[PDB]
Amino acid sequence: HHHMVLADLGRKITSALRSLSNATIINEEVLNAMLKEVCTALLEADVNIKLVKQLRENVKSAIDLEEMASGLNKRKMIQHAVFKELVKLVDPGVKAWTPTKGKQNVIMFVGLQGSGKATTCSKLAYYYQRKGWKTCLICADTFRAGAFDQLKQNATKARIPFYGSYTEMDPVIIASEGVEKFKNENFEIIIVDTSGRHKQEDSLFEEMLQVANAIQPDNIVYVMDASIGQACEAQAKAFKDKVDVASVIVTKLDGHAKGGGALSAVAATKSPIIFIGTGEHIDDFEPFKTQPFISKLL
């Protein structure tokens, strides 16, 4: 109830919908003033103006205040048209990849520097661990001088089987031998962590494709820092074009107003968002279901 990670965006939208429903008479002047408050609320959440303009057109096209046939309550329709369009804004419109029970699902992780990818790997492995999946963790991370220590102690947190090496230098052979070990051990969720000290987007795609060709994963997850706002559009579009199955986890949605713009930016690229990072705890991780996400927002 507006305790959401997008609460400041929620307070502004509800007040616009609350003011509209409480209008003595509903007309186009009251409707236009409501969109102005919502369209501004989205922009202050760093939503791209192109997305905010398209939202306004979709709302006015769905509403036909001039010819209102019997039985229709406009005020309640005005609010759902806003609600229904807020769902489109954060929905990629593409069915995400899901693991198959009884099969062996290899999932590889990629992410830039300062994205929380290393800890986000632990949350997904623990997520499937509480759901009854036989899960594991592989740290194919080279040259972080502590990436394996972080997994060694983070896998300790959720008692998750982990395989990695301090000394071995090729990430391709660490992930391959890691997937080979756990595949023959009948694991259903095999999570491979790649290196996180990548600053530019091209350096990520080199290691990403090196490790992917060897282990042949069933899914590749891009972990994005939402604190960059609508600038996620460049990252989302680039990563999706260079993989077969693309999925995006968004972390650091809290502590900044740019979270709502990052979600709509990745959704605009038609990249499936599969999970949310909302804070620092290990159970602070939840899948991205758009309709419950927007309904609780309002």
Swiss-Prot record:
NG domain as annotated region, ranges: 4-298
GO process annotations (BP): exocrine pancreas development; granulocyte differentiation; neutrophil chemotaxis; protein targeting to ER; SRP-dependent cotranslational protein targeting to membrane; SRP-dependent cotranslational protein targeting to membrane, signal sequence recognition; SRP-dependent cotranslational protein targeting to membrane, translocation
GO CC field: cytoplasm; cytosol; endoplasmic reticulum; nuclear speck; nucleus; signal recognition particle, endoplasmic reticulum targeting
Disease: Neutropenia, severe congenital 8, autosomal dominant: A form of severe congenital neutropenia, a disorder of hematopoiesis characterized by maturation arrest of granulopoiesis at the level of promyelocytes with peripheral blood absolute neutrophil counts below 0.5 x 10(9)/l and early onset of severe bacterial infections.
Name used for this protein in its record: Signal recognition particle subunit SRP54
Molecular function GO labels: 7S RNA binding; ATP hydrolysis activity; endoplasmic reticulum signal peptide binding; GDP binding; GTP binding; GTPase activity; ribonucleoprotein complex binding; RNA binding
Main location: nucleus
Shown residues within the full chain: 1 to 295 of 504
Coiled-coil region list: none
Disulfide-bonded cysteines: none
Keyword GTP-binding: yes
